[PDB]
């Protein structure tokens, strides 16, 4: 069933999201002290990625 | 993994962060253990059937 199909889907798409907010998660509570943030990390995330969404950290 | 060299000089935040990194530690021992156990586990018990 047409229904069916899309509810499977959906589940898979649901399943894909539970690993994606626990990746989120894990880079969410990360501190100096733990971690070091590479070079590459801080141009893609805090400059390129942030405008292409248009977000634009404050940086104040 | 390697830690930061930080230098702390809180005795008692550090001795925490300490134990918040121990904690960490033995998750991704685990993480790595049974990422290798559920791999060869289902591999282990389905590949035969099949060939």
Redesign the interface.
Known sequence: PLVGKYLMFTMVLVTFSIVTSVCVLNVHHRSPTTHTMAPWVKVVFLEKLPALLFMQQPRH | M???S?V?TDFERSVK?DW??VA?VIDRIFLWMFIIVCLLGTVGLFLPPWL
């Open positions: 390697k830690r930061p930080v702390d962060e918040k990194y960490m």
